[PDB]
Amino acid sequence: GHHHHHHHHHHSSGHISGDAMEDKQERANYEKLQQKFQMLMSKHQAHVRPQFESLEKINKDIVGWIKLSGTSLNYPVLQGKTNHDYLNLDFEREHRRKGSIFMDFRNELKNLNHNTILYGHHVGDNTMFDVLEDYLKQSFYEKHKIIEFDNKYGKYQLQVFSAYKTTTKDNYIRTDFENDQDYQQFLDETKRKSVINSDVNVTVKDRIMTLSTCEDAYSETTKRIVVVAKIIKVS
């Protein structure tokens, strides 16, 4: 008939059965929010501001939405005053190990900085940023070159051009650069590190978005997966 998932998923705790009740409840909350957002989008076909003004009623910290068709990446983007505000908090401001997909506290929304950074968990249960790992394969990249990114000030597409693995020590990412030479070096370095080949033209006149896995404090994880994309304005 008309099914969004392999199996039917109950949303009310009282009807959720089986193992991992909590995980299923967390999943239910995202499914509910995805539905609310999808209806908002289909309704405001000519704009994007109303969609987010509606989401802000839930939490003013919801500053965007990121979605990749055919994958589990379909979540609200949170932003706090630090890069750990939403590390272990969901969009309802409830404590959750996986937290939220969140934007670096330094980034602007109305007029994007040179490099906009989003962070998310990668626990390997096919949620949040687990999808970034799939980008390390050329086959997957080719079929998922465009990611949707929306915010109150516009609708964008992220044209993926680099995916690689690094350490968890690499904790300082620049949002803007001293000059074109440094930005050019960053772009060149980004393509150089990529384990996948891309034909995307990115120049110093362009803006990019960095998607990075992020781990819990005092975690054993040693590697991070990074995916970088060129930001394209849709409407």
Q: What is the total residue count of the chain?
A: 235
Residue whose pair of structure tokens reads 């590190």 in the numeric block:
193
| Distance in angstroms between the alpha carbons of the first and the last residue of the chain | 33
CB 145 → Ni ion: shortest distance, Å?
A: 33
CB 234 → Ni ion: shortest distance, Å?
A: 35
Catalytic residue, from 33, 87, 214, 231: name it.
214
Stretch that binds Ni ion, among 10-18, 55-63, 167-175, 185-193 (CB under 5 A): 10-18
Residue 7 engages Ni ion in binding (rule: CB under 5 A): yes
Which CB, 72 or 175, lies closer to Ni ion? 72
Residue 4 engages Ni ion in binding (rule: CB under 5 A): no
Which CB, 10 or 43, lies closer to Ni ion? 10
Are 65 and 37 within 8 A, CB to CB? yes
CB 90 → Ni ion: shortest distance, Å?
A: 11
| DSSP character at residue 167 | E
Residue 233 engages Ni ion in binding (rule: CB under 5 A): no
Cα–Cα distances in Å, from 125 out to 2, 36, 131, 132? 25, 24, 10, 13
d(CA 24, CA 130) in angstroms, rounded, equals 17
Residue 3 engages Ni ion in binding (rule: CB under 5 A): no
d(CA 235, CA 228) in angstroms, rounded, equals 21
Residue 32 engages Ni ion in binding (rule: CB under 5 A): no
Residues facing 228 on adjacent strands: 162, 210
d(CA 9, CA 147) in angstroms, rounded, equals 25
Is 155 an annotated catalytic residue? no
CB 34 → Ni ion: shortest distance, Å?
A: 16
CB atoms closer than 10 angstroms to residue 21: 11
Residue 10 engages Ni ion in binding (rule: CB under 5 A): yes
Return the residue nearest Ni ion (CB atom). Answer: 10
Binding site residues, Ni ion, CB under 5 A? 7-8, 10
Give catalytic residues, as residue numbers: 214
